[PDB]
Structure 1
Amino acid sequence: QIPASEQETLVRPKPLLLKLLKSVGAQKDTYTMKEVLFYLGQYIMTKRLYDEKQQHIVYCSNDLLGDLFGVPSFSVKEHRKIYTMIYRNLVVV
């Protein structure tokens, strides 16, 4: 469904997303989606919003991430929905 070429595309995070990304990676004017996905994923793991003991679901209602995605939780395996939530928070270059 999701082509690997999508990860090479260039995007610019809006202010709130950039704030989250900055807590795990260096600030950049333009990121590749691969970068956005890793930093977002790393943020989730270091803050333990995703416990591999809790069946693929990320709980973020007590985190800025929840404000960013507009949901209290989501599955790490439903990638299509994740992409859609992320794009609400960035502008394509």
Structure 2
Amino acid sequence: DLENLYFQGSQINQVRPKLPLLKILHAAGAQGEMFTVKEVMHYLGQYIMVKQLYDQQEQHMVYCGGDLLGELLGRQSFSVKDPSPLYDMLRKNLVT
């Protein structure tokens, strides 16, 4: 079966975060250095919540400037409603 052959070894699609992103994920309670992309997104959400980087009045707005997270994103701020910067950063910082 060619569909099985294709997907064997590629059904979970684990990634290894680059060291600066791994440090963010650990800060959010993550353990180890291999994750699903879904786990990476969970821990990034949790990081923003526990470091209080979001605007209490406009909770979709993240103010990441002067945080390691803003360094990785290359941004002072972003909206979760317009997450192009997060896509860019994860493409660059998640290995295989």
Which TM-score applies when normalising by structure 2?
0.77
The amino acid across from 1:48 in the alignment is: Q
Task: Please name the residue that 2:70 is paired with.
Answer: 66
Which of 44, 69, 72 aligns to 2:48? It is 44
Kindly indicate whether structure 1 or structure 2 has the higher relative contact order, using CA contacts under 8 Å at least 6 residues apart. Answer: 1
Task: Please name the residue that 1:89 is paired with.
Answer: 93
**DSSP-derived class of the 1:22 partner:** helix
- Give the superposed CA RMSD: 1.7
Question: Which runs of 5 or more residues in structure 1 are unaligned?
Answer: 1-7
For the Cα contact (< 8 Å) 1:49–1:59, is it kept in 2? Answer: yes
Q: Residues 91 and 48 from structure 1, CA distance in 2 versus in 1: closer, same or farther, beyond 3 angstroms?
A: same
Q: Residues 39 and 55 from structure 1, CA distance in 2 versus in 1: closer, same or farther, beyond 3 angstroms?
A: closer
Which TM-score applies when normalising by structure 1?
0.79
Q: Percent of aligned positions with the same letter in both sequences?
A: 55
Question: Which runs of 5 or more residues in structure 2 are unaligned?
Answer: 1-11
Matched, 1:75 2:94: no
Q: Residues 90 and 42 from structure 1, CA distance in 2 versus in 1: closer, same or farther, beyond 3 angstroms?
A: same
Which of 5, 14, 18 aligns to 1:14? It is 18
Separation of aligned partners in 2, 1:89 and 1:32? 13
**Of 62-71 and 72-81, the range deviating more from structure 2:** 72-81
The count of aligned residue pairs is: 85
TM-aligned CA deviation for residue 45 of structure 1: 0.8
Q: Structure 1 segments of 4 or more deviating over 3 A?
A: none
Q: Residues 29 and 56 from structure 1, CA distance in 2 versus in 1: closer, same or farther, beyond 3 angstroms?
A: closer
